[PDB]
Amino acid sequence: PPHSLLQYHLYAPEQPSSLKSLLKPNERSADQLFIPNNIREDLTKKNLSILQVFPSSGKVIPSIVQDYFNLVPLNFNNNDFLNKTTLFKVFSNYDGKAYVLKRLPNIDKSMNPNKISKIYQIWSKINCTNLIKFRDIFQTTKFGDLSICLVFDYYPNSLSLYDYHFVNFPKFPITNNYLWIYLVQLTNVINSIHSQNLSIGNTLNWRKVLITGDPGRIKLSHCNFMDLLFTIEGQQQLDYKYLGELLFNLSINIENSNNNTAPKEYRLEEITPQSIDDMRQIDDKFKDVLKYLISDNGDSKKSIHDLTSHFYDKMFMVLESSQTYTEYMESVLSRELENGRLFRLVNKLNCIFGRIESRIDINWSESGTKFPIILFYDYVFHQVDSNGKPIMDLTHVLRCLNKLDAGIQEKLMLVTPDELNCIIISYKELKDLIESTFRSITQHHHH
Amino acid sequence: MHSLLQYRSADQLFIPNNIREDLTKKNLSILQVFPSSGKVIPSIVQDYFNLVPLNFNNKTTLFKVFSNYDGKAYVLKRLPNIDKSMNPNKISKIYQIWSKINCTNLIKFRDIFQTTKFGNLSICLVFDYYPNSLSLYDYHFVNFPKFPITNNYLWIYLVQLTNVINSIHSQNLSIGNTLNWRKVLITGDPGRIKLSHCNFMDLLFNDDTDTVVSSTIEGQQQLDYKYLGELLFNLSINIENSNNNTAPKEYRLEEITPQSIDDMRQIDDKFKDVLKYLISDNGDSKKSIHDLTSHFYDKMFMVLESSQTYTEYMESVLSRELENGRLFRLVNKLNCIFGRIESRIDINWSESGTKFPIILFYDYVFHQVDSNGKPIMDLTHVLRCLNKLDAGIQEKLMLVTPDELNCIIISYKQLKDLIESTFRSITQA
Amino acid sequence: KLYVGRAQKKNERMHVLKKQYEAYRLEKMAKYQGVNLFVKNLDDSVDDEKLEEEFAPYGTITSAKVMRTENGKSKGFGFVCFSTPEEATKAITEKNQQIVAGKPLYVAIAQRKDVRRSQLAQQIQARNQMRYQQATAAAA
Amino acid sequence: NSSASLYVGDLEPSVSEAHLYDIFSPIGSVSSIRVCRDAITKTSLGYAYVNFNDHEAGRKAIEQLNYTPIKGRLCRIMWSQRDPSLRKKGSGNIFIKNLHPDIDNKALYDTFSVFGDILSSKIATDENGKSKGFGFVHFEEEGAAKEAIDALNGMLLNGQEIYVAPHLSRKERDSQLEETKAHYTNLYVKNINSETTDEQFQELFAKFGPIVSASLEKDADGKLKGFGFVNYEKHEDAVKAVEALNDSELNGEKLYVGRAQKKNERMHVLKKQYEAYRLEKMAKYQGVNLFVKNLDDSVDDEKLEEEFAPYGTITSAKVMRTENGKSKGFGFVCFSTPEEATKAITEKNQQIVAGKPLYVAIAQRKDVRRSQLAQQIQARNQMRYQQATAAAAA
């Protein structure tokens, strides 16, 4: 209910990478052990974005709309200023489902549910990445009156690309990588509308293109009733007009994102072929793509082939990038899973270690089994180095944790504690020993 | 206080049902190494050690190896038959030709070396170990189970091989005989199939790589088109055949049958255009992958669909795993110095000693007795206390022996200070 | 006049001597732990050398760029080295909550390479969310 | 981008944040009031700040209330976003000087707001409205200030120009009163030989400050005192020949130039004497003197000097009284011996001289205030223990 950060290198701090500038492949690190900071803070920001509420009512807005409660507004940079806005986060009865609800009040010439029903099923049958779930549309007597509600998914980080590059705080642009990525996302969704036989819809140009996912997303939410809330070949011709508009726009906005200067949008009567031939840091093949994306003159509903009749290699390089992101995502997810397993493991370790009555002798052993338990604990945790100073190495520990976590039949030699009573032991025996000790102490029916 | 209770197919197509269990089984395959291999080659050979094998005929040349210089699971292949590599010039040339070879499904060339450690001479090369290497014919037909194949997966694998084609032909070279199902390696529940062998063992034996301009690698392009076509054709006719068990139907370039390639069971005309583009190896074509991808034209978007959907599913499940690393460093600080044998019995750790209650609360959590006196965890309370002590806020804490002694009512930030002070004093003087 | 024409440091890292010597420097930087601290608020009543010998009992400044704007206008800032982090802790505990004239002589670590503007960004975001919330509640 | 966080300067201690809230509560969006009670003894820094949730209501409260009397003193409410940067830059309050002594920040603000919103405006408006005729006015930035310079340097404003060209020090309404053609601090040259004439006081001296008036000062005794009044052009050249022609040769004789009748625009001569007195005022002893309080009244400097005659070379025996009447306890003997003073720390501390005991401590008016600080400490301590006692006493 109070406003604070708790992320000022506070959730986990930053570490000097000047040591990492001169570092060996043997030399590992805690981020290399666990996670880099960026994904962590992004996911926690996403979690708080999901739960941006601390327990109150918010009854000044209508609060329950047909088993959709906790109407809380997406106030990221909400373009309904000096007005009670229409796009809220809401929680369903089922899944508690995090939803963007958009309610359009004050309608009179849309009383037929059949028009919104065919726009519903016609756009519920669609299925793509950037084709956010078109759901739950009916006019209601709340949000003022006659609010036609529609529902998309919540999908945080509302980053309509002007947000993602120009409201953006470190000011990074999008070079040719995200160029081709957004190119194949738009090519995907125009192939989707040529498939499902609908228009371009309404919105483009830094509107409804909020980037929820990481690797470069379109996620175009509104391709809906522009005017018919209350030919198709011409609409699938003017798709090229909208599209080449955005492409000329960002293809010259690279030159403005050279500096930290907020750009203006450069609508259809600024698309000039001299500016095509004269803008900088642009592929001239991509300039010829925009020469085709000089909008659709012959008014056939042209599919994506004549667009893609210049190239296919960079689509494969985009696919390459997506596979690269998924692979090292699975790498760091493997690191996180093995950390969770080993944390449960050390929970089992210190569960019975350190009884008060056991700490009597030098080694703190009470009964028969406990000294062959805590036999391990010196070379696992209390590892003084070769030079003689007591230190900690997280990578000898983790290789040990790897070799013990399975409980394999391989043995190991130890000296504990008098450096006379040597030992060797195999690790399945250790596993079963800890299990039998756990049932011997935390029997969980009587003990 | 700060939180409550929180957080077959069509296009997603990558849905393991117990998926983190599958990944920890994969890492379990990464784990062990059987030390009693009895190999005349020892562990410590040529910057690598703990050489444990895999299945017979690449009964060796497939070695799981934990690395010395890197510390990473690698695969090794012996080539235990050749013995003559008279020019390190061509060995360095191969080091150039594959150290620059960079892709995804082409698994990266690490290094090569001709050892004398097996008894014989052997030009052993290494690549990256991936857990649980299979073919698609393994993934369905050779090994249990047999997932019923759709055309979607065929498009996916088609995208994979065209990626390989784009990769090696950006590198203006070719492959050779690797496009049998056996010599490729899938990478799990998705296809994402990463080839390994790449058939360059002949290059160690003579010199035909783009210098023979007959190039001859264009003939190898058309050859790999033919291998590609029989690979997909055996995949198709065997998937229709081994709906349950009828595997394989091994067909060759001789058994190419462009009649029954076109009279296949369930391949559409677009697939038939694909296989007819493969099978009509005519003169002077040097077939355009731009044309064949224009024949494909849609599946790039479908594998991007599956890729980002599986990706979002990975972070959606990764949401509830992140609370480990801070916690594991907490345990690192905790059991880094708890029972050091110099400090097991000394002056500043007794009940009259300095760092006395840092012991006491320690196992207070860990041996909190029940109403019957049984030390029972109730890990809710444990992690509650763990995050509270991790914080540093100011609380009041009852503590007993159980009986009437050494009771101290305390807060956290001073415990923080003594912990870091002790850790730093341990770390150096 | 033996006119000694000085050379600025243009030779960097060719032999092994800067590689191993900067390995020893990095081994020192593993053991400094915030020695050279940013002096913030060089106040009016505290001069450069006045600072430099107020904290000469509390650290050895091996690199002293403590100036004003060529001793014209104030810098307001400098660099003063310390001994160890716990000597930094005692320097915190002794020289705290003293207004000299209007600004405290806050010699500490260096930060804010963005993070002032990250804070200002999240505060504007919080004000926007709370401002629509309070506008909604006020509009009832 | 702060909504509003606004400077309120030239305050008086009557204006609390209750009174600021009573002023700015019909503005509309009261967020907070940072009254800058600086943490020495809750003193103002000369200012405070008011924070507003609304940027527009903050701009409103500035442009309505800039030198308006909040509880009788005009409110110097401006912007201070760049003012910590003006602090740790040295810049800020530039010297737009020769201002008007009857025009405050409000009238000249609304006048030269055509030159700009003056982000750091002050005139010499102390004393509940009286300006001395100058101040530190500075606009937004260098461009608007330079526009005001190049547009208005020497114009007319109620029969007065301004001067931002030179960093003109204080007393600028009375600058021409200082520059009046009759009075001037002359230069007494001491021990002059009779060879120097009215001609000779202008020969080598007119270069060091131009001379028309050159007077061989004979006295009312007919002779020369040896002291001659050199009449330069400006008191800075009186400075130039008191600290450049000091014991110099005009022809062959001394120029011990002292300042004949200082007019106070150059100053602080022998103020170091003050700090020389700081060798012996509050750090009283230098382990030499003895603040011996609580004598008898019959113990005069008579009996004090009588007691301290075995205690070294007595240099200053002195008891302050009610106008040489009633002493209220205290005397002093500045010694010349520190070890006999240590012998008195042994002996003459805790000493009956006549019937009432001697009291020895080093003499300062300095740490009376530090003792009052300790009184504040013990007062807040007994307040705290009484608060705990009344809390837990039930």
Place this chain on the structure above:
Amino acid sequence: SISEDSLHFANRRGVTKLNLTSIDIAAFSELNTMCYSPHSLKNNIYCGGDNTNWGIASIDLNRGCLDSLLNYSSKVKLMCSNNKVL
């Protein structure tokens, strides 16, 4: 608190600041009684010894370690001071 061997000092909370034995010199071996030192009243002690080093010692309680030692030979039953006496 002071025992025959251990000299402990907790805070009024009950939390522990110090506790020592005869650490490396035989300070807290023979222990008799507590005092305070002549710099302040409720401050560092001048702890009474008899022959543990046959010299009575002050220890700065609030720094953690030594204040002063002195050579008084004879045994002491009891000790007092108002402000600066012994």
Place this chain on the structure above:
Amino acid sequence: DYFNDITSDGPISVDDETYPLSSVGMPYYLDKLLSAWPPVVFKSEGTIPQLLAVISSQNEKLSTQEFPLLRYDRTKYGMRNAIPDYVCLRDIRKQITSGLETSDIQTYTSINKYEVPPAYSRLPLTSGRFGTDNFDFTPFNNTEYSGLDPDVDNHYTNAIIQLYRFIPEMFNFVVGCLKDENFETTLLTDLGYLFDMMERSHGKICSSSNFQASLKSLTDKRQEEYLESLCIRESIEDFNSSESIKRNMPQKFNRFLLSQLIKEEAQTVNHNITLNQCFGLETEIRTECSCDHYDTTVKLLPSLSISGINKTGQNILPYIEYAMKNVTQKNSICPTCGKTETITQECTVKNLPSVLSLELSLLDTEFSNIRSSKNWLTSEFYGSIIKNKAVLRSTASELKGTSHIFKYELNGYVAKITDNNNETRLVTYVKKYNPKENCFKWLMFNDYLVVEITEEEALKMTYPWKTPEIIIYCDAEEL
């Protein structure tokens, strides 16, 4: 005991997945938490890991399903809970790189104490009949002293070669033994041929393959107290090992080397014991097992292993005075007790032979203390038999003893260098006497590198990379 405890219901002790480790914990903090991790190298992943005394009732009192074994030895398997240093085959790539080219490698002086100077480094391999090629040595030595070749399976005793060549008692003895045939005395004769070859070579390079193969083939001809020395001996094969220079190997090698030297000395054609008396410490060792069933034995043990029990100020001479006379106990089973025999044992050297060996076996704490103690070791000390102990003072004026003050001057020692590149090798320090000028010199011998350093540099132990292990005091007149 604050009431943020309205509910925490389920005992979810470990491994429940109806609630994972994703924290539902903390109240909202303000500042940095405990897991601030300090920077470290973490440089020990993957460095090729590997694999009478009865069990006391330190652990037997709680033994059930037991399997203990009281067999751990400190020299055998090293430091308890230690982590080995990292040296992969990038160091073998450095062995592929050249050693030195067109300068002098003989820089034995680093400005930093941590850096290994170039003279203490590995010298490169001796390429034989390579293509119109061979390896040369003339920059490595400019003196007239013969060099060795490390291409032999000792890796150790090359320094012992350069050591025991420089004892004129030993040298003139064995070169007297050479003039007879003595077909049975293998190591005596072959060592003598090796030292005479190094003598008359006059700077010419030498190898030890005759004596390497002779020592080896004798120690190959294996299956007593000789065999009790040999029971841990032959574990040197298959040279792959975490220790190339190992803790206890060259110590036992010099031990039973001198033992076999005195055996072949005792089986000459003349059968002298001149080295045995001349080098032997008269250790009356009194293994006081029982009051009756015990042993006293005077063994003429020529070396002195430094066990280092409590190091009984900081310098070497009281530690040697401990090692002469010392009593302790032991739990070795003598049959007259049946149970765990709490036996005791005292040791007293009864002579002062003119040459005193010092083999070191101690923890790295005291080695770092010698790195702190400047001039820790003693250059020349005077010793005498006081009543039950050789008191070993600097001069006699400290304490004259009760028997015959001698004059014992150090000749040299063997320096283990464990460099910055994690390479462990050996270097002879010796102080050759000159009777022509009655002076001395400190010859540093690496494998074939021959220089002279100063005495205090030879006495300098402050380097972290430098460690003495095998120290030979001589008599000053016998020096």
Place this chain on the structure above:
RNA sequence: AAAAAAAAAAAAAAAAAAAAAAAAAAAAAAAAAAAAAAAAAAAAAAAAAAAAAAAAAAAAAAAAAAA
């Protein structure tokens, strides 16, 4: 017969000295006169002024063995 308490908590209070017009004095050569954060807030390390950097240290090996 202006005749005041003879100092808590190391309180607490002295200064140890000047323009000299004493006589017939003009208008800043000053060397610079130059206050603003405080809603969880201002933040170089490398080592720090190139007022003169020649910078491939020749090479060649017809090759071994040793029956």
